[model samples]
Target chain A: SNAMAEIKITPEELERIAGNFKNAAGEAQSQINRLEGDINSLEGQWAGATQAKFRGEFIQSKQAMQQYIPILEGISTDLKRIADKFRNTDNAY
Target chain B: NAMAEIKITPEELERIAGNFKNAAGEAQSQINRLEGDINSLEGQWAGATQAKFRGEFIQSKQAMQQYIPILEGISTDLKRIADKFRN
Candidate 1:
């Protein structure tokens, strides 16, 4: 018999977990956004003579965050969804 | 006109960018795993003793906060370098 793992968390605990998730996810998203803005500003400066040292780091940082943005957003959305779910369940029961 | 100096080559730029990107990816991946663990912990939360849960949650929050500054630092470093391109 395959039994789904049941959690015996109190509504308060669930709320705390959900809150932490939202806080963590929100911080990540905001930091990612700030990084993206920095990258965009850097991109604007790229038309001139390219200094390999700075340019390299700039491009790398930008590309890295670019790839990460979607993932960060996903986590943020997922956390919010989960938080909402817990709150709703808490209210219903 | 006082001329400004330039440093590094386009090829070198590309190389450095590649390396930085790779390192950032690894860092992000690590964070992702951390997030996953937290998610799993949330699921099994009921199984954990209250003290264990509290400790773990606090630790997770600490870890999450720790990485933010590093990421921000990287972004700032990039901006500093990018300033070179500005006319």
Candidate 2:
């Protein structure tokens, strides 16, 4: 038999993991949003320096989280596409 | 569910931050389990394409590894704020 190798990866499995990554990332983002909401809700309570520190640090943290989640979502999308690409040609599917 | 606390107390802020931490921690736990599941796929094949996939997958996995801790940082910051206000 000619030794040309077939793709052995499980596309559905990768797709499943893509879903997992997406969901986990979403959950994390939701919590970040929740935390931001809490910070915003309490903003009127604090004094000058207190408010300044909270807003400055919280905004930095919030923006970093905002930046990171999109990378995760992109990974999820890429994984889904990889799964679809493999599944399209694989007769086993 | 009752509405989020309208006014803040040290105990209340701590409680809310604790809940946020738990949710973020749960997300982290799920991610870790998923990572374990995906690692098994590595052994099922080998090729140039597989190598490429492996590289990208590892990069993705590393990126994921950073997410939960960032989330934890947010929760931790909330808790620290709670503690500060408590004193």
Residue A57, candidate 1: how far off, in angstroms? 2.4
List candidate 1 stretches off by more than 4 Å. A1-5, A8-50, B1-87
Q: Candidate 2 chain A — worst ten consecutive residues by lDDT sum?
A: A1-10
Top model number, lDDT: 2
Candidate 2 per-residue lDDT, tens place, B1-87, comes to 587547777776677667656866675576567557556556554555456645655665565456556556656766787788877
> lDDT score, residue A10, model 1?
42
Docking class of 1: incorrect
- The estimated TM-scores of all candidates read 0.37, 0.70
Q: What range of 10 consecutive residues in model 1 chain B has the weakest lDDT sum?
A: B5-14
Each model's fraction of native contacts: 0.10, 0.24
After aligning candidate 2 to the native by TM-score, how far in Å is the CA of A32 from where it should be?
A: 1.4
Q: What is the TM-score of chain A alone in each candidate?
A: 0.46, 0.84
Model 1 lDDT, residue A44, Cα:
43
DockQ, all candidates in order: 0.12, 0.34
Clashes of each: 0, 0
**Residue-by-residue lDDT tens digits, candidate 1, B1-87:** 354433444443344444434444655555666455455655453444334544544454455444444444554555455455452
